[PDB]
């Protein structure tokens, strides 16, 4: 239909350690919701305070939670998470001031402006209840004070009753169009994966969604996200004949990100693995028994590994599969286009 974008008049003050619940108006379907922490970081102290390094400024928003009906969760990433995912999908050009380690002039200030972006394909926001994007802000850097607010810019596409019929009308229960592609960008944290030279089991990818890419990054207690422990990553398809879709050295995994994202590594402890490149198309686990694909890590020391997945689910996945080769072809093409809209 008619995509059209706007900022919501109403902003939200970034306060330290708060959960700021935001209601996202339900006018049409929602294509992408941008949020920006915009203001400045002030130093009122006598000596020039240098800002914490990566993941800052990103971790200023400790966590994100965009969901509908208060329970069905489309998004769950931390600012540090969605922030690095944002850094890659945009060639390290994603808005993030100030850069890590930058100085707030003694009794003066710098500029604050960070962004996040939740891509909802073409989310049927008119047919669901309450899409609430709760930003649980983190902690203000040491020595400096954050004077910013959030700006929610929402992108609607006037999907009409007519057009909706043209892609398979509604679902089995008719709560969304048949060709709905609900983004399911979740991030599951693992703690104390012990140090090893041989990739030791880190965590399983749980079924109920189609995985497009996975952003894994480890966090040392000392260097934060600027460590170099991840040495050998490994995606083992455990179910069926046991196989290694991936067994690349950390360096080589960061290498594919050079070619893939044309951007230097966000840090020594991060990378991204695109499943469309190790399977034919996206790695689907909609019906695969749980514990069918796990991913490993050879950590120099023993740390915490965060794995953010950019996945999406098809709420009528079977009706899409049980559709006549006639209709399925047309419906598949709408779902197909939508599946790629959810990049970042």
């Amino acid at each position: 239909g008619e995509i059209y974008t706007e900022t919501l008049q109403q902003t939200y003050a970034w306060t330290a350690g708060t959960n700021i619940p935001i209601k996202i108006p339900r006018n049409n379907f929602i294509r992408k919701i941008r949020v920006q922490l915009i203001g400045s970081i002030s130093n009122s102290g006598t000596a020039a305070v240098t800002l914490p390094s990566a993941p800052f400024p990103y971790n200023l928003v400790q966590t994100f939670n965009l969901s509908y009906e208060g329970s069905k969760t489309l998004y769950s990433v931390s600012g540090t998470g969605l922030g690095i995912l944002m850094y890659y999908t945009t060639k390290g050009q994603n808005p993030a001031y100030p850069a890590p380690g930058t100085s707030v002039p003694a009794s003066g200030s710098v500029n604050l402006n960070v962004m996040w972006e939740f891509d909802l394909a073409r989310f049927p926001a008119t047919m669901v209840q309450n899409i609430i994007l709760s930003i649980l802000t983190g902690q203000a850097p040491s020595g400096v004070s954050i004077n910013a607010s959030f700006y929610i810019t929402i992108t609607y596409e006037r999907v009409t009753a007519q057009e909706i019929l043209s892609e398979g009308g509604l679902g089995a229960d008719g709560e969304m169009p048949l060709a709905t592609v609900l983004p399911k960008v979740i991030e599951i944290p693992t703690f104390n994966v012990p140090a090893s030279s041989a990739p030791i089991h880190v965590a399983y990818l749980q079924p109920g969604q189609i995985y497009k890419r996975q952003l894994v990054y480890v966090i040392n207690s000392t260097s934060g996200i600027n460590n170099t422990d991840p040495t050998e990553y490994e995606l083992k398809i455990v179910r069926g004949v046991p196989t290694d879709k991936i067994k690349v050295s950390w360096a080589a995994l960061q290498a594919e990100n050079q070619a893939e994202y044309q951007v230097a590594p966000y840090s020594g402890a991060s990378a991204i693995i695109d499943f469309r490149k190790y399977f034919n198309g996206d790695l689907d686990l909609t019906h695969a028994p749980s514990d069918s694909i796990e991913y490993d890590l050879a950590l120099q020391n023993q740390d915490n590994v965060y794995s953010l997945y950019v996945s999406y689910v098809l709420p009528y996945y079977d009706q899409l599969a049980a559709l006549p080769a006639q209709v399925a072809a047309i419906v598949q093409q709408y779902v197909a286009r939508q599946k790629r809209r959810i990049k970042r």
């Binding site: 959960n19 619940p21 009906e69 208060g70 329970s71 069905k72 669901v128 209840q129 309450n130």
Partner: protein, 220 residues
């Protein structure tokens, strides 16, 4: 036609039930916490008033509008410290917890919402309050040394108990309390110290002469 039929049917129910957990500070700085449960489905679980403040919890049938109680549409239950609001298949469209206009200033509670929204079944909808008054022996501070790291608000009318324990006996310091336009200073001994107080009284200072264990609570 008279029919005698016999059929043993296997049936199962696969209906997705999504859990929910939302804890929002509720105080003079955050008057409204609002949890969105969708009108179409039904929520069952707990709304926990884990705090000292009393909140007015108004569940509405109609979304997009309220912020006050739309009559017939939404019903309101008042909840005090420790009272749980239990839901049994109550189809709500939004739960709005308002920090009560009548609380003693400074008192806050973390209203947490833990339950699951599952489709609305053909069984009754219900509400009730579990744990109606845990007689509260309300705990204010536990720590050690010779002074307090912060000021504290006393939540209710009752008796302030300051228990000071050390390896000795006798006079150990002083406490200062304020309410409104009054200040009071009290002598502290080891063991129990009991002071009648009214809701909202502030503990503004304590100074001890020797390092001690410090326990402050209110018998209400």
């Amino acid at each position: 036609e008279v029919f005698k039929e016999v059929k043993e049917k296997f049936e199962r129910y696969k209906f997705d039930v999504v859990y929910v957990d939302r804890e929002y500070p509720v105080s003079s700085n955050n008057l409204n916490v609002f949890f969105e449960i969708g009108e179409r489905n039904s929520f069952s679980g707990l709304l926990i008033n884990e705090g000292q403040a009393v909140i007015d919890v108004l569940l509405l049938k109609k979304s997009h509008e309220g912020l006050s109680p739309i009559p017939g549409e939404g019903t309101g239950i008042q909840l005090s410290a420790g009272q749980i609001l239990k839901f049994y298949n109550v189809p709500i469209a939004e739960i709005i917890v308002e920090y009560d206009p009548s609380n003693v200033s400074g008192v806050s509670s973390n209203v947490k919402l833990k339950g699951t929204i599952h489709p609305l079944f053909e069984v009754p909808s219900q509400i009730s309050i579990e744990n109606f008054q845990p007689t509260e022996n309300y705990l204010i501070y536990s720590g050690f040394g010779t002074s307090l790291p912060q000021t504290y608000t006393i939540p209710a009318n009752g008796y302030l108990i300051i228990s000071i324990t050390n390896t000795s006996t006798g006079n150990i310091g002083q406490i200062t309390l304020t309410i409104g336009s009054t200040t009071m200073t009290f002598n502290l001994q080891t063991g129990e110290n009991k002071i009648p107080v009214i809701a909202g009284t502030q503990i503004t200072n304590l100074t001890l002469t020797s390092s001690s264990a410090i326990l402050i609570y209110e018998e209400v």
